[PDB]
């Protein structure tokens, strides 16, 4: 039971600005699954999100090889890219351990892989590529977190009209 919130043809600017709005209205030990294909604009999303925690965009980079980058800010964002993941033990051990921290925000380029692993209450963010310079995005907000929907919705009708 969870509200899907679609955003149609978004500028590279507005994309980051949605990400910053999600991420400042977060509270604790929260998973943001980032679903999207090569080029979608996931990493660019996280660029927008890190704004919220008082660090600079410039320290966001494909964790495709690093696997995890950690932005220790107003909250500490852990950033995963599963593109390269070979050992599922990283999830069963390392990522299970990351999940025990309840004052910090996880976010996962390709968290739509290994679906069984992630939580019921995880926030899902499909990013799609409708244009050379625009991307369409759908934020799914599990009902145990409706405190977001008001705040995000504002920006849905703040853009449309």
């Amino acid at each position: 039971k969870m509200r899907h919130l679609r955003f149609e043809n978004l500028t590279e600017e507005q994309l980051k600005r949605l990400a910053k709005i999600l991420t400042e209205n977060l509270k604790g030990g929260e998973v943001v699954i980032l679903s999207g294909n090569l080029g979608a604009g996931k990493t660019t999303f996280v660029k927008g999100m890190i704004r919220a925690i008082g660090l600079d965009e410039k320290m966001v980079k494909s964790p495709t090889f690093t696997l995890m980058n950690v932005y220790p800010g107003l909250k500490t964002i852990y950033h995963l890219d599963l593109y390269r993941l070979q050992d599922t033990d990283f999830l069963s051990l390392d990522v299970e351990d990351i999940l025990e921290d309840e004052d910090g925000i996880m976010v996962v380029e390709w968290g739509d892989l290994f679906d069984g692993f992630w939580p019921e209450d995880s926030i899902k963010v499909k990013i799609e590529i409708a244009d050379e310079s625009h991307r369409n995005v759908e934020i799914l907000i599990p009902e145990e977190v409706n405190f977001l929907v008001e705040k995000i919705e504002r920006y849905r009708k703040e853009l449309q009209n």
Partner: protein
């Protein structure tokens, strides 16, 4: 001076013992505990490393070890904290010193090994997957990141633009291989952050440019796209390395990393060095520039200068020069 060096940063869990940073006494690496023993698994450090100390101290007597070196950054906190936490406790139980290796410092070093008589005022470009970077190496051997990608490694660009092109793994070898057939001056793909006051790169620019063409367009030759894009990566690299080797004034230039290996890089770099008269350098044939020999060496030179680390030393997974 036997250094006992420990690897827990790479995916091969490695232990080595190296007298005087030259003569190698025993090299054990889990990788080579599978077809020489044809369980112990890919990169399961805390399970593997014990067996390699077992294998090392059966051959090397425990006394003889003079320094214990072990990487502390960059890598993954969990991986690092196993070689490092373990090497610290060797030190304690050997009553010997321990040395934290900065891996990318150590990587840059073996350049000074691939030619003993190579003088150390020199500019390294490091073009891996994990890393893309220009540096100074001062006559004293003091390094600084001057150039750094802001988004993607050249290594990552290659691997995904390969994926986009319905080409195999590994990324670069395949694109290098199949651009040989193509026309690198065929599509005018963007060279982000060229002709600049910055020494920095972006690449996610390209990956998207290619993807947008692949989507919009059709009728196109794959080679030709592959060649067109490899040149646009080589133009941005070859320009910056030589704009900066000039701008500060160096003639000897080192190329470390996987992207290193690229025939069109090595060919274009070469027609710059053969024409401004510069000495140009590459790593060894069977690139495993990543063993415990690496960190033993690293930690030898360190100890050589009585530059030791304290048992308080934490891993830094984001460690650079």
């Amino acid at each position: 001076m036997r250094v006992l060096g420990i690897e827990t940063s790479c995916d091969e869990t490695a232990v080595a013992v190296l007298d005087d940073g030259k003569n190698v006494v025993v090299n054990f690496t889990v990788s080579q505990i599978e077809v020489h023993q044809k369980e112990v698994a890919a990169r399961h450090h805390l399970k593997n490393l014990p067996i390699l100390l077992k294998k090392a101290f059966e051959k090397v007597p425990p006394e003889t070890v003079d320094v214990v070196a072990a990487t502390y950054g960059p890598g993954l906190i969990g991986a690092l904290l196993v070689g490092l936490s373990a090497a610290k406790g060797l030190a304690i139980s050997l009553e010997k010193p321990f040395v934290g290796v900065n891996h990318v410092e150590a990587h840059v070093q073996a350049v000074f090994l691939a030619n003993p008589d190579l003088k150390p005022p020199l500019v390294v470009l490091m073009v891996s997957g994990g890393h893309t970077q220009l540096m100074k190496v001062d006559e004293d051997y003091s390094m600084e990141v001057l150039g750094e990608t802001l988004d993607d490694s050249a290594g990552e660009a290659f691997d995904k633009v390969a994926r986009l092109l319905g080409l195999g793994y590994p990324g670069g070898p395949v694109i290098d291989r199949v651009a040989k057939k193509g026309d690198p001056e065929k599509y005018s793909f963007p060279r982000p952050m060229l002709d600049d006051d910055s020494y920095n790169f972006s690449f996610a620019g390209l990956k998207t440019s290619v993807l947008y063409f692949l989507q919009r367009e059709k009728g196109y030759k794959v080679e030709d796209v592959a060649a067109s894009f490899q040149k646009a990566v080589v133009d941005i690299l070859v320009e910056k390395t030589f704009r900066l080797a000039r701008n500060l004034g160096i003639r000897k230039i080192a190329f470390v990393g996987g992207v290193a290996a690229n025939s069109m890089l090595r060919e274009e770099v070469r027609k710059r060095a053969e024409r401004w008269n510069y000495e140009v350098f590459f790593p060894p044939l069977e690139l495993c520039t990543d063993n415990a020999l690496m960190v033993a060496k690293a930690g030898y030179e360190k100890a050589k200068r009585g530059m030791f680390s304290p048992l308080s030393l934490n891993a830094d997974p984001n460690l650079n020069v």
